[PDB]
């Protein structure tokens, strides 16, 4: 547990003792030194602050600290087990708050899970926002000549990782704000669109057009809306773009207005029905852009009674009170 | 018996002889003459060839021929019964061409028939154009103040008289040609208007208006039409003047035209329907009579789709193709 001045120290692979002394020494016998270090392929032994501290580099074989007095017989060696060795490797069960892991023996981490959440750098790996993640991390050693693989450590997560603090579990896809069913931050997996619960609204999107006020619309908020506190759109309504056989569509035949927003519409039926908007531009007959002269012929008739023919322009009998009209346009 | 030169002749009601001679004489004593005629209310005695022939004018009382010689006593009178008095009436069945009848015994003809077609003068009567007539003519004689009535003869026509030549069986009433259902000439009975037949029509009169051409009308000929041949109108049809729910009437509210004819019409319902005519008068907006300034606002829309509000003047969404119109009319 501590380095003593009149003792010899070494690292051992076994506890056995023979006629010439301890068996299985991995290092040579080293005299006491303040800060003295013993080194082999598996461990680094350091004499620090009058205390014995260790740093494992590999755990494939069991290691001991061998102690022998300078005056004593070489067969009087004392061993202190540092760690038990397993060639197939140690199996670590990842706890709920597990984040960082280091693969021993300079092994490469091989991740087998629900979705990739791991950041990898040499033998080091990082589980980034593993919310709902299950699977294993296998520390593997390859061979340049034989091409055989050996496992030195297995990190396992049987049941899903619970919710983790400091993880954004909402992601913008295009302009729509989606929920992260699994993961967080960049490890996020898209589920469904987030729904409007409350809060201040920046704008709303309905039938492919943007609105910031209720005027002209059936109601407000409508369709999907973006909060002043977010960059994406949350789903508010499922309201139909089809109104009286008149469907508001981003690529429409005729332009008209809903409040301040210019809207495009298409006819679904040729029935007599209203437009779900207000006129885009009202052109005058005497207007500078277009000149069209108006003249009309009229006669006396009985109420709701018509004479032949039907107005050339309107294709209908123009009747008001006890009079019939026939217009002539430029 | 015959007449002889040295005898006197007379007509008698009886065979009785008194101290002064014959007592039932109806005529005066007449001397022999070659055509000698004796006349009374019942008989006409004529000695045509020296041989007597008779013509009865009544048979209710018995008549005798009284003969008396010029040299003999007036009580030596001889009587020859001409006929026995028959108090029962005769019954004549009027033939198809029967026209004149004479009531015997100077009786008055009493006519009981379908309609009045008889000309009457004393006992004489005349059936004037009796086409379809049925009934009886009773020759009646009333005596003193008894009030008793006696039928001397009955003229009967059980089945109707057939059509008779030389009788006009069509009469004009105002301007319409009517058919004479019974009679003819002045005895005519008119009940229905003559139905049209033939090729040449002068003019038609439907709903109180005159037409000479098919233009504007439902069809032609229509209503009552006059032939080039006649003065009156003949019935062609009963077609309604109520065209839809609009009536064509001689005294109407609004004037309009059917062909060349100016027609007057009245509304019977306010339901959306057509006028059965063409406009009478077409007044222009820029016309000299009246001036009306026309201006309009328009926008693009979808077919049969409207924007608010309705046209102020038309109280309707003015839509043509993909354009909506709003008119502004101002009187000048
Ligand atoms: C999975 O994880 C690695 C580590 O961040 C990342 O670079 C890689 O792009 C991921 N795979 C995909 C296809 O997103
Ligand atoms: C997730 O992102 C936020 C904001 O960039 C950051 O504060 C947080 O540390 C990230 N979480 C992890 C586990 O990297
Ligand atoms: C503000 O935005 C955050 C996400 O950045 C969201 O979780 C929160 O619910 C929003 N605030 C309100 C009041 O809805
Ligand atoms: C003609 O006939 C009518 C109807 O029967 C009758 O009232 C009228 O008195 C008759 N007139 C003559 C002149 O016979
Ligand atoms: C009817 O009148 C016509 C014309 O005057 C005449 O020829 C005819 O004899 C008349 N018939 C009778 C029976 O009155
Ligand atoms: C005219 O002709 C019709 C037959 O088409 C005939 O009934 C009518 O009596 C004729 N009139 C004259 C005056 O000839």
XYZ file of C-alpha atoms and ligand atoms in Angstrom:
746
model
C 0.000 0.000 0.000
C 3.139 2.133 0.267
C 6.775 2.267 -0.896
C 9.343 1.652 1.940
C 13.080 2.730 1.686
C 14.845 -0.645 2.343
C 12.653 -2.750 -0.039
C 12.777 -3.935 -3.699
C 9.603 -3.598 -5.841
C 8.452 -5.334 -9.079
C 5.292 -6.285 -11.080
C 4.316 -9.998 -11.327
C 1.999 -12.067 -13.611
C 1.590 -14.749 -10.845
C 1.959 -15.405 -7.035
C 4.038 -18.677 -7.358
C 7.546 -18.917 -5.585
C 10.425 -21.237 -6.631
C 13.948 -22.079 -5.308
C 15.481 -18.943 -6.967
C 12.601 -16.710 -5.714
C 9.231 -15.381 -6.984
C 7.941 -16.771 -10.276
C 6.474 -14.726 -13.137
C 8.149 -11.327 -12.683
C 7.263 -9.005 -15.584
C 9.643 -6.180 -14.501
C 13.167 -6.164 -12.987
C 13.684 -5.533 -9.223
C 13.739 -1.761 -8.568
C 15.217 -0.041 -5.477
C 13.083 2.496 -3.544
C 12.978 6.004 -5.052
C 10.570 8.915 -4.305
C 8.279 8.839 -7.393
C 9.764 5.493 -8.638
C 7.806 3.921 -11.484
C 7.368 0.254 -12.481
C 6.150 -0.428 -16.025
C 4.953 -3.401 -18.079
C 2.412 -4.067 -20.919
C -0.560 -4.098 -18.454
C 0.124 -1.582 -15.581
C 2.059 1.573 -14.504
C 2.970 1.543 -10.776
C 3.835 4.950 -9.266
C 5.219 5.944 -5.852
C 3.196 9.170 -5.287
C 2.943 11.312 -2.028
C 4.252 8.320 0.028
C 1.239 6.316 -1.288
C 1.022 3.630 -4.005
C -1.155 4.628 -7.026
C -1.779 2.667 -10.270
C -2.767 3.273 -13.929
C -4.018 0.245 -15.916
C -3.120 0.110 -19.625
C -4.536 -3.413 -20.177
C -6.556 -5.954 -18.095
C -6.173 -9.184 -20.255
C -3.935 -10.834 -17.570
C -3.888 -10.688 -13.720
C -1.156 -8.449 -12.195
C 0.499 -8.372 -8.730
C 2.907 -6.031 -6.907
C 5.936 -8.053 -5.705
C 7.717 -6.816 -2.535
C 11.130 -8.123 -1.317
C 13.388 -6.755 1.473
C 17.021 -5.843 0.549
C 18.468 -7.967 3.451
C 15.907 -10.867 3.275
C 16.088 -14.137 1.228
C 14.720 -13.952 -2.403
C 12.109 -16.685 -1.556
C 10.498 -14.406 1.174
C 8.648 -12.367 -1.576
C 5.187 -10.902 -0.725
C 2.508 -10.334 -3.438
C -0.402 -7.848 -3.556
C -2.995 -8.468 -6.347
C -3.655 -5.232 -8.287
C -6.474 -6.636 -10.521
C -7.913 -9.939 -11.837
C -7.313 -10.629 -15.535
C -9.857 -11.880 -18.078
C -8.579 -12.565 -21.649
C -12.181 -12.382 -23.028
C -12.449 -9.017 -21.179
C -14.300 -7.181 -18.383
C -18.063 -6.590 -18.812
C -19.187 -3.095 -17.674
C -22.907 -2.314 -17.211
C -23.380 1.340 -18.294
C -25.178 3.308 -15.542
C -28.012 5.839 -16.290
C -25.604 8.855 -16.227
C -22.687 7.061 -18.076
C -21.051 9.422 -20.620
C -17.320 8.623 -21.119
C -15.575 5.271 -21.580
C -11.976 4.350 -22.431
C -11.191 1.086 -24.236
C -8.211 -0.683 -22.589
C -5.150 -2.187 -24.434
C -5.560 0.737 -27.015
C -8.584 -1.161 -28.488
C -11.055 0.314 -30.996
C -14.657 0.777 -29.745
C -17.260 -1.011 -31.903
C -20.773 0.347 -31.266
C -23.856 -1.890 -31.801
C -27.042 -0.052 -30.829
C -30.528 1.333 -31.623
C -28.998 4.475 -33.340
C -25.501 6.118 -33.390
C -25.048 8.391 -30.279
C -21.337 7.824 -29.815
C -18.401 10.170 -30.495
C -15.228 8.158 -31.116
C -11.524 9.099 -30.752
C -8.951 6.284 -30.697
C -9.753 4.084 -27.653
C -12.025 6.806 -26.160
C -15.770 6.977 -26.796
C -18.562 9.295 -25.631
C -22.275 8.495 -25.304
C -23.896 11.786 -26.467
C -27.521 12.235 -25.245
C -28.284 8.471 -25.262
C -32.007 8.922 -24.402
C -33.781 5.598 -25.099
C -30.571 3.977 -26.472
C -29.838 0.250 -25.910
C -26.865 -1.814 -27.084
C -23.167 -2.610 -26.587
C -19.687 -1.046 -27.028
C -17.040 -3.703 -27.809
C -13.372 -2.787 -27.388
C -11.693 -4.758 -30.189
C -8.102 -5.570 -31.172
C -7.316 -6.396 -34.813
C -4.316 -8.159 -36.421
C -2.488 -6.769 -39.467
C -1.266 -10.244 -40.611
C -3.848 -12.843 -39.324
C -6.974 -10.503 -39.552
C -8.378 -12.088 -36.299
C -10.359 -9.966 -33.795
C -10.222 -10.176 -29.971
C -12.567 -8.489 -27.419
C -10.820 -6.909 -24.376
C -13.912 -5.114 -22.872
C -17.708 -4.988 -23.363
C -19.846 -1.993 -22.268
C -23.548 -2.951 -22.114
C -26.951 -1.195 -21.794
C -29.799 -3.830 -21.715
C -32.684 -1.475 -20.718
C -33.080 2.011 -22.384
C -31.105 4.967 -20.992
C -33.560 7.360 -19.201
C -34.002 11.120 -19.978
C -30.746 13.085 -19.597
C -30.311 16.747 -18.518
C -28.624 19.156 -20.954
C -30.065 17.537 -24.103
C -32.266 19.281 -26.702
C -35.092 16.836 -27.565
C -36.728 18.929 -30.379
C -35.342 19.286 -33.935
C -36.273 21.507 -36.901
C -36.768 19.631 -40.207
C -37.048 22.217 -42.960
C -39.387 24.709 -41.246
C -41.326 22.196 -39.053
C -40.489 21.557 -35.371
C -40.317 17.829 -34.600
C -40.072 15.785 -31.369
C -36.991 13.629 -30.680
C -38.414 10.160 -29.856
C -34.814 8.963 -29.259
C -31.577 10.799 -28.452
C -30.875 14.507 -28.071
C -28.756 17.296 -29.677
C -27.264 15.892 -33.007
C -28.087 12.229 -31.978
C -31.807 13.116 -32.199
C -34.239 10.771 -34.114
C -37.359 12.388 -35.637
C -40.692 11.142 -34.350
C -43.699 13.427 -34.979
C -44.296 17.230 -35.268
C -44.585 19.146 -31.960
C -48.054 20.433 -31.084
C -49.026 23.932 -29.943
C -49.748 23.903 -26.176
C -49.435 27.667 -25.589
C -47.157 30.714 -25.790
C -46.697 33.887 -27.920
C -47.051 33.263 -31.716
C -44.709 34.981 -34.240
C -46.717 33.792 -37.318
C -48.896 30.961 -38.710
C -48.678 28.929 -41.932
C -51.859 27.719 -43.642
C -52.285 26.294 -47.203
C -48.631 27.232 -47.947
C -49.061 30.950 -47.065
C -47.871 33.038 -44.055
C -50.260 35.006 -41.724
C -49.534 37.220 -38.663
C -53.170 38.403 -38.073
C -56.737 36.897 -37.962
C -58.268 39.152 -40.717
C -59.764 37.211 -43.667
C -59.011 33.784 -42.100
C -61.748 31.431 -40.695
C -59.921 31.687 -37.295
C -56.439 32.368 -35.803
C -54.146 30.536 -34.895
C -54.657 28.197 -37.904
C -52.699 25.321 -39.558
C -49.178 25.357 -38.079
C -47.653 28.229 -36.061
C -44.145 29.355 -35.017
C -43.509 30.621 -31.462
C -41.511 33.883 -30.883
C -39.219 31.687 -28.702
C -38.567 29.025 -31.474
C -37.259 28.713 -35.099
C -39.634 25.877 -36.189
C -43.401 25.492 -36.765
C -45.619 23.626 -34.251
C -48.827 21.954 -35.555
C -52.002 23.873 -34.408
C -54.878 22.790 -36.760
C -55.903 20.281 -39.479
C -58.386 22.761 -41.125
C -59.213 22.083 -44.774
C -57.836 24.331 -47.541
C -61.022 23.469 -49.525
C -63.741 26.116 -48.891
C -67.006 25.942 -50.993
C -65.130 24.017 -53.740
C -62.410 26.720 -53.700
C -59.069 25.287 -52.459
C -56.235 27.629 -51.348
C -53.018 26.170 -52.833
C -49.391 27.608 -53.083
C -49.517 27.110 -56.914
C -52.979 28.431 -57.894
C -54.768 29.730 -61.024
C -55.986 33.105 -59.597
C -54.425 35.561 -57.082
C -56.583 37.064 -54.270
C -56.112 38.388 -50.684
C -56.651 37.111 -47.100
C -55.833 40.063 -44.816
C -52.412 41.354 -45.981
C -51.304 37.983 -47.479
C -51.483 37.405 -51.257
C -53.092 33.971 -51.769
C -53.453 31.634 -54.819
C -56.650 29.586 -55.397
C -58.001 26.785 -57.711
C -61.649 25.823 -58.532
C -62.750 22.268 -57.552
C -66.381 22.708 -58.801
C -68.094 25.056 -61.325
C -71.019 25.693 -58.851
C -72.178 29.193 -57.747
C -70.204 29.768 -54.519
C -68.112 32.425 -52.706
C -64.363 33.126 -52.962
C -62.543 32.506 -49.607
C -60.643 35.786 -50.146
C -60.976 39.487 -51.156
C -60.055 40.824 -54.683
C -56.299 41.192 -55.405
C -56.663 44.218 -57.713
C -59.731 46.125 -58.917
C -59.253 47.444 -62.494
C -61.448 50.403 -63.617
C -63.168 50.616 -67.076
C -61.822 54.228 -67.415
C -58.560 53.223 -65.632
C -55.248 54.310 -67.284
C -54.046 50.656 -67.815
C -57.360 49.505 -69.519
C -60.039 51.517 -71.469
C -63.487 49.850 -72.021
C -66.573 51.931 -73.076
C -69.996 51.023 -71.605
C -73.388 51.489 -73.353
C -76.765 49.797 -72.845
C -80.196 49.306 -74.468
C -83.303 49.013 -72.253
C -87.094 48.369 -72.559
C -90.156 48.145 -70.262
C -91.328 44.632 -69.224
C -93.252 42.871 -66.394
C -91.502 41.871 -63.104
C -89.201 38.792 -63.636
C -90.371 38.590 -67.308
C -87.810 38.540 -70.152
C -87.676 39.358 -73.903
C -85.390 37.748 -76.482
C -82.354 37.733 -76.703
C -80.124 37.111 -73.699
C -77.466 39.790 -73.137
C -74.499 39.109 -75.447
C -71.934 39.857 -72.690
C -73.577 38.319 -69.573
C -75.308 35.314 -71.285
C -78.272 36.088 -68.942
C -81.477 38.207 -69.062
C -80.502 41.448 -67.265
C -83.666 42.302 -65.310
C -84.255 45.039 -62.705
C -87.820 45.805 -61.621
C -90.001 46.420 -64.691
C -86.972 46.919 -67.052
C -84.614 44.707 -69.171
C -81.028 45.690 -70.081
C -78.639 44.763 -72.960
C -75.027 45.966 -72.506
C -72.428 46.797 -75.186
C -68.783 46.744 -74.024
C -65.500 47.635 -75.862
C -176.771 15.439 -110.338
C -176.498 18.237 -112.957
C -177.962 21.638 -113.762
C -180.921 22.158 -116.140
C -181.984 25.502 -117.773
C -185.468 26.057 -116.233
C -184.464 25.387 -112.560
C -183.261 27.411 -109.523
C -180.350 26.163 -107.398
C -179.196 26.855 -103.784
C -177.211 25.304 -100.849
C -179.096 24.158 -97.707
C -178.122 23.281 -94.071
C -181.253 21.047 -93.712
C -183.973 19.151 -95.703
C -186.942 20.927 -93.894
C -189.781 22.641 -95.833
C -192.151 25.297 -94.424
C -195.189 27.290 -95.719
C -192.902 29.825 -97.540
C -190.636 27.044 -98.931
C -187.168 25.725 -97.937
C -186.179 26.793 -94.369
C -182.496 25.791 -94.171
C -181.144 27.873 -97.085
C -177.561 29.099 -96.706
C -177.429 30.788 -100.169
C -179.939 32.798 -102.281
C -181.807 31.161 -105.224
C -179.657 31.297 -108.387
C -180.954 30.944 -111.987
C -179.276 28.447 -114.376
C -176.010 29.650 -115.946
C -173.306 27.539 -117.698
C -170.558 28.115 -115.005
C -173.057 28.975 -112.132
C -171.412 28.878 -108.653
C -173.090 28.684 -105.246
C -170.970 29.648 -102.207
C -171.360 29.318 -98.396
C -168.980 28.822 -95.360
C -168.844 25.011 -95.971
C -169.004 24.323 -99.771
C -168.419 25.738 -103.305
C -170.849 24.220 -105.855
C -169.787 24.586 -109.517
C -171.703 23.607 -112.615
C -168.694 23.304 -114.925
C -170.214 21.315 -117.879
C -173.916 21.335 -116.876
C -172.748 18.656 -114.381
C -172.066 19.713 -110.765
C -168.626 19.378 -109.106
C -167.941 20.393 -105.493
C -165.077 21.817 -103.375
C -165.451 21.493 -99.577
C -163.992 24.300 -97.370
C -165.493 22.856 -94.082
C -167.336 19.610 -93.076
C -168.546 20.321 -89.473
C -172.215 20.789 -90.665
C -174.238 18.703 -93.184
C -174.904 20.388 -96.586
C -177.566 19.793 -99.289
C -178.148 21.025 -102.860
C -181.655 22.549 -103.094
C -183.426 22.334 -106.498
C -186.645 24.243 -107.385
C -188.359 24.601 -110.807
C -189.075 28.169 -112.097
C -192.799 27.365 -112.770
C -193.379 25.061 -109.715
C -194.538 26.080 -106.164
C -191.740 27.102 -103.678
C -192.768 24.203 -101.320
C -191.974 21.580 -104.085
C -188.165 21.899 -103.336
C -185.967 18.766 -103.822
C -182.779 18.193 -101.741
C -179.613 16.200 -102.569
C -177.226 15.589 -99.603
C -173.648 16.583 -100.553
C -171.976 15.363 -97.302
C -172.784 14.468 -93.666
C -171.488 16.733 -90.880
C -168.263 15.291 -89.398
C -167.491 16.889 -85.985
C -164.171 14.934 -85.630
C -160.848 16.462 -86.739
C -158.486 15.421 -89.569
C -154.756 14.541 -89.086
C -152.214 15.477 -91.812
C -148.590 14.267 -91.588
C -146.441 17.137 -92.992
C -144.162 15.814 -95.771
C -140.431 16.787 -96.046
C -141.137 19.536 -98.664
C -144.412 20.815 -96.991
C -144.566 24.618 -97.058
C -148.208 25.853 -97.111
C -151.256 24.719 -95.207
C -154.803 26.077 -95.040
C -156.913 25.565 -91.907
C -160.473 24.455 -92.865
C -163.734 25.992 -91.469
C -161.831 29.398 -91.254
C -160.003 28.028 -88.135
C -157.022 29.709 -86.469
C -153.674 27.832 -86.694
C -152.123 27.181 -83.255
C -148.404 26.339 -83.615
C -146.637 24.150 -80.995
C -143.044 23.464 -82.030
C -139.273 23.526 -81.368
C -138.867 27.157 -82.573
C -140.937 29.852 -84.360
C -140.768 29.349 -88.245
C -144.371 29.993 -89.192
C -145.913 32.895 -91.128
C -149.633 33.204 -90.224
C -152.529 34.894 -92.089
C -156.105 34.061 -91.036
C -156.568 30.281 -91.554
C -153.425 30.125 -93.791
C -149.959 29.290 -92.431
C -146.491 28.903 -93.989
C -143.553 26.816 -92.757
C -140.512 29.019 -93.634
C -137.171 27.047 -93.799
C -138.300 24.475 -91.135
C -134.904 22.691 -90.980
C -134.872 20.466 -87.862
C -138.361 21.635 -86.758
C -140.776 19.207 -85.019
C -144.251 19.858 -83.654
C -147.909 20.389 -84.518
C -150.217 22.972 -86.157
C -153.737 22.786 -84.702
C -156.570 24.451 -86.619
C -158.868 25.617 -83.825
C -162.452 26.930 -83.837
C -164.117 28.564 -80.823
C -167.894 29.257 -80.865
C -169.832 32.177 -79.248
C -168.810 32.751 -75.557
C -168.884 28.971 -74.619
C -164.997 29.016 -74.719
C -165.133 25.310 -75.923
C -162.308 24.504 -78.363
C -162.674 22.254 -81.431
C -159.788 20.949 -83.577
C -160.871 20.893 -87.289
C -157.500 19.387 -88.337
C -154.029 18.664 -86.944
C -150.803 19.053 -88.975
C -147.967 16.940 -87.428
C -144.180 16.486 -87.852
C -142.958 13.791 -85.358
C -139.416 13.449 -86.899
C -137.363 16.640 -87.761
C -137.818 18.275 -91.186
C -134.674 17.512 -93.280
C -132.420 20.139 -94.956
C -134.340 22.342 -97.427
C -132.982 23.925 -100.648
C -132.996 27.729 -100.944
C -132.372 28.373 -97.226
C -129.379 30.316 -95.797
C -128.152 28.352 -92.731
C -125.322 30.730 -91.615
C -125.686 34.141 -89.945
C -123.202 36.923 -89.084
C -123.488 38.215 -85.481
C -121.282 41.284 -85.206
C -118.121 39.981 -86.898
C -118.445 36.182 -86.315
C -119.971 33.625 -88.723
C -122.477 31.541 -86.709
C -124.146 28.299 -87.764
C -127.961 28.024 -87.887
C -128.560 24.866 -85.746
C -132.276 25.118 -86.651
C -134.185 26.942 -89.390
C -132.891 29.129 -92.211
C -133.238 32.679 -93.653
C -135.045 34.866 -90.985
C -136.355 31.786 -89.041
C -132.687 30.797 -88.270
C -131.653 29.863 -84.678
C -127.878 30.457 -84.136
C -125.994 28.781 -81.276
C -122.380 28.015 -82.323
C -119.644 29.772 -84.348
C -118.766 28.139 -87.731
C -115.583 26.033 -87.631
C -112.935 26.893 -90.262
C -112.254 24.803 -93.452
C -110.539 25.561 -96.799
C -107.424 27.266 -98.161
C -107.650 31.095 -98.279
C -107.519 33.176 -95.048
C -107.672 37.012 -95.217
C -106.766 37.631 -91.502
C -106.885 36.069 -87.991
C -107.970 37.566 -84.621
C -106.364 36.065 -81.478
C -106.630 37.616 -77.952
C -108.395 40.663 -79.483
C -105.565 41.466 -81.949
C -105.346 41.077 -85.766
C -102.652 38.949 -87.513
C -102.082 38.268 -91.246
C -98.749 36.334 -90.816
C -97.293 33.505 -88.603
C -94.259 35.499 -87.246
C -94.147 35.721 -83.419
C -97.299 33.579 -82.941
C -97.245 29.998 -81.463
C -98.808 28.826 -84.795
C -100.916 30.149 -87.729
C -103.917 30.058 -88.356
C -104.942 30.897 -84.717
C -108.159 31.979 -82.838
C -110.894 33.189 -85.210
C -109.959 33.763 -88.879
C -111.897 35.354 -91.789
C -111.885 33.790 -95.280
C -111.262 35.886 -98.450
C -114.715 34.458 -99.428
C -116.692 35.888 -96.442
C -117.376 38.981 -94.225
C -117.414 37.180 -90.852
C -114.881 35.242 -88.740
C -114.724 31.422 -88.451
C -113.451 29.569 -85.348
C -110.027 27.854 -85.865
C -108.984 27.181 -82.172
C -109.480 27.895 -78.378
C -105.692 28.391 -77.651
C -105.058 30.162 -74.336
C -104.094 33.851 -74.234
C -102.245 32.946 -71.063
C -98.804 32.322 -72.577
C -96.946 30.816 -69.565
C -98.336 32.926 -66.714
C -98.590 36.076 -68.958
C -102.003 36.973 -70.512
C -102.367 38.694 -73.948
C -105.469 40.921 -73.500
C -106.926 43.846 -75.643
C -106.700 46.150 -72.551
C -103.239 45.394 -71.099
C -100.675 47.076 -68.800
C -97.594 46.859 -71.142
C -97.278 47.157 -74.945
C -95.077 44.656 -76.884
C -94.932 43.101 -80.407
C -95.916 39.806 -82.104
C -94.737 40.080 -85.734
C -96.056 43.448 -87.001
C -98.998 43.562 -84.524
C -98.772 45.749 -81.391
C -100.009 43.610 -78.479
C -101.028 44.439 -74.852
C -100.182 42.073 -71.942
C -100.958 41.627 -68.172
C -98.989 39.621 -65.552
C -100.924 36.834 -63.736
C -97.868 35.633 -61.698
C -94.531 37.248 -60.654
C -92.618 33.947 -61.334
C -89.428 34.042 -63.516
C -90.819 33.466 -67.030
C -90.686 34.649 -70.669
C -92.683 37.415 -72.404
C -94.822 35.990 -75.289
C -93.701 38.929 -77.468
C -90.715 41.065 -78.622
C -89.937 44.591 -77.196
C -92.191 47.446 -78.422
C -89.750 50.356 -77.626
C -85.919 50.094 -77.172
C -84.555 53.248 -75.408
C -80.733 53.699 -75.547
C -78.505 54.849 -72.625
C -76.769 57.347 -74.966
C -80.076 57.947 -76.782
C -81.377 61.494 -77.379
C -84.543 60.868 -75.176
C -82.475 59.915 -72.130
C -78.862 59.959 -71.097
C -77.360 57.543 -68.516
C -73.613 57.411 -67.762
C -72.172 53.869 -67.468
C -68.969 52.899 -65.565
C -67.775 49.612 -64.050
C -65.151 48.069 -61.707
C -63.815 44.541 -62.410
C -61.471 41.849 -60.890
C -60.225 38.323 -61.784
C -61.972 35.330 -60.098
C -62.669 31.585 -60.672
C -65.584 30.432 -62.915
C -68.975 30.908 -61.131
C -67.125 32.166 -57.983
C -68.051 35.530 -56.416
C -66.465 38.229 -54.181
C -68.359 40.587 -51.821
C -70.479 42.705 -52.375
C -73.321 42.143 -54.951
C -73.728 44.709 -57.807
C -75.534 47.742 -56.214
C -77.755 48.185 -59.321
C -78.418 44.505 -60.231
C -78.679 43.053 -56.589
C -76.665 40.073 -58.074
C -73.013 38.975 -58.502
C -72.162 40.049 -62.079
C -70.007 37.174 -63.346
C -68.706 36.514 -66.885
C -66.049 33.834 -67.347
C -63.382 34.562 -64.746
C -64.300 38.273 -64.321
C -66.608 39.897 -61.734
C -68.215 43.278 -62.522
C -69.615 46.159 -60.386
C -71.563 48.802 -62.360
C -72.104 52.490 -61.539
C -75.056 54.123 -63.331
C -75.723 57.901 -63.200
C -78.642 59.848 -64.801
C -77.603 62.866 -66.971
C -22.816 8.257 -36.518
O -21.858 8.810 -35.582
C -20.652 9.441 -36.059
C -19.969 10.046 -34.851
O -20.426 11.363 -34.546
C -20.995 10.478 -37.123
O -19.824 11.138 -37.592
C -21.705 9.786 -38.272
O -22.004 10.735 -39.290
C -22.988 9.126 -37.770
N -23.680 8.470 -38.869
C -24.559 9.096 -39.671
C -24.753 8.493 -41.029
O -25.116 10.139 -39.340
C -26.247 19.633 -26.056
O -26.234 20.955 -26.601
C -26.225 22.002 -25.618
C -26.279 23.313 -26.371
O -25.314 23.372 -27.416
C -24.999 21.857 -24.718
O -25.071 22.823 -23.676
C -24.959 20.457 -24.109
O -23.786 20.301 -23.318
C -25.004 19.386 -25.200
N -25.048 18.060 -24.603
C -24.101 17.128 -24.783
C -24.237 15.890 -23.948
O -23.180 17.273 -25.583
C -40.124 28.029 -25.518
O -39.254 27.205 -26.296
C -38.833 26.011 -25.618
C -37.855 25.312 -26.537
O -36.776 26.168 -26.897
C -40.061 25.172 -25.273
O -39.669 23.994 -24.574
C -41.028 25.985 -24.414
O -42.204 25.224 -24.159
C -41.404 27.299 -25.103
N -42.136 28.161 -24.188
C -43.469 28.128 -24.022
C -44.024 29.076 -23.002
O -44.192 27.365 -24.660
C -140.924 32.852 -80.334
O -140.353 31.823 -79.514
C -140.113 32.240 -78.158
C -139.537 31.050 -77.418
O -140.405 29.918 -77.452
C -141.397 32.798 -77.540
O -141.109 33.336 -76.252
C -141.987 33.901 -78.418
O -143.175 34.422 -77.830
C -142.267 33.396 -79.836
N -142.701 34.500 -80.681
C -143.563 34.395 -81.711
C -143.765 35.642 -82.521
O -144.138 33.345 -81.983
C -134.480 32.486 -98.477
O -133.913 33.686 -99.013
C -133.476 33.587 -100.379
C -132.844 34.914 -100.737
O -133.772 35.986 -100.635
C -134.655 33.211 -101.276
O -134.196 32.970 -102.602
C -135.343 31.959 -100.741
O -136.496 31.667 -101.523
C -135.740 32.146 -99.276
N -136.431 30.965 -98.782
C -137.524 31.007 -98.004
C -138.298 29.728 -97.897
O -137.876 32.030 -97.422
C -115.847 30.187 -99.576
O -115.301 28.863 -99.548
C -115.757 28.033 -98.465
C -115.062 26.700 -98.620
O -113.649 26.839 -98.574
C -117.281 27.924 -98.500
O -117.743 27.237 -97.342
C -117.909 29.315 -98.555
O -119.325 29.210 -98.643
C -117.365 30.101 -99.748
N -117.981 31.416 -99.818
C -118.338 32.017 -100.966
C -119.006 33.352 -100.823
O -118.131 31.509 -102.065
